[model samples]
Target: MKKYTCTVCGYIYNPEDGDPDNGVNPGTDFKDIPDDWVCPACGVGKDQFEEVEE
Candidate 1:
């Protein structure tokens, strides 16, 4: 899985280390995230996340 970064607060979302704080399990890709899921750091929406190159 790839990585995504929050445009609002620079929060890095890693699929390999899904956000347990938000109930996201490991191996959860960006596309697999729910629409209601927000950035743990800034509360930004999934659409606000930008894919980061590996």
Candidate 2:
């Protein structure tokens, strides 16, 4: 599993599908990012995605 949290808000994203609007719906990959999608909570860049797997 992998986990990612909003650095600015501590919103946790897990299982690669934790939040639908956050690109975790389809996936966390850039390819899964909807062109119009934006982070509603923290408004961070898509590049903020980080891989944290075990």
Candidate 3:
């Protein structure tokens, strides 16, 4: 699993297991994001995501 942060909203995405919803889930991997899905926390596009430290 990986830790990620939303550049626009500072939302930390922790990978627990799997995708939580249709958009992006809590455990959803950064690479698992749909090509057209928006951020569930801040609605920012996929380009604004960044991996966080462990």
Candidate 4:
């Protein structure tokens, strides 16, 4: 699975470890995340995140 990072706060969103506190389950893909979901660290929108090539 791919990982995404918040451009504003450098918060990395890993599909294998989804944001449970925000209601996202583990193994959830980035595309599956809700549009209204914001970065827990910076509170930025999904648009502010970019895929992290590994």
Candidate 5:
């Protein structure tokens, strides 16, 4: 699994523990997040999340 960081608020997302509050189940990859998905913290679009180096 990979990790993605929100560009707006610096919130980090883990595929292993998908955003439950956002209705995303675990194991959901960043690519699988819908286009309308926004950052839970800052409400930025999914495009604003950048894959972080692991």
Candidate 6:
């Protein structure tokens, strides 16, 4: 799975280590994350995130 970065806060969303604090299970793909999921670090929307090159 790919990783995504929060454009607003530089928070990296790793699929292999999902946002468990936000209820996202490990290995959950970014696309599979709910639309309502916000950046745990900065509280930004999902739209603010962009795919990161591995």
Best by TM-score: 4
Error of 5 at 54 (Å): 0.7
TM-score to true structure, per model? 0.91, 0.44, 0.68, 0.96, 0.90, 0.94
Candidate 5's C-alpha runs over 4 A off are: none
Provide the clashing-pair count of each candidate structure.
0, 0, 0, 0, 0, 0
Q: Give the worst 10-residue stretch by lDDT in candidate 2.
A: 22-31
> Which is better, 3 or 5, measured by lDDT?
5
Cα misplacement distance, residue 18 of candidate 3 (Å): 4.6
Candidate 5 achieves a global lDDT of 0.90
CA deviation > 4 Å runs, candidate 4: none
- What candidate 1 gets wrong by more than 4 Å, as runs, is none
lDDT of each: 0.90, 0.56, 0.71, 0.96, 0.90, 0.95
Q: Is candidate 2 or candidate 6 better by lDDT?
A: 6
Model 5, TM vs. native: 0.90
Question: Looking at candidate 1, what is the lDDT of residue 22?
Answer: 82
What lDDT tens digits, residue by residue, belong to model 3 across residues 1-54?
A: 777777999876666743466556566677776767666778887678788876
- Give the alpha carbon lDDT tens digit for every residue of 1-54 in model 2: 556555666655564564664445634654355656545577776456555555
Candidate 1: residue pairs that collide: none
Scored by lDDT, model 6 comes in at 0.95
Identify the runs in model 2 with alpha carbons over 4 angstroms from their true place. 26-38, 49-54
Q: What tens-digit string does per-residue lDDT give for candidate 1 at 1-54?
A: 789999999999999999988889989998888889999998868999999987
For model 6, which pairs clash?
A: none
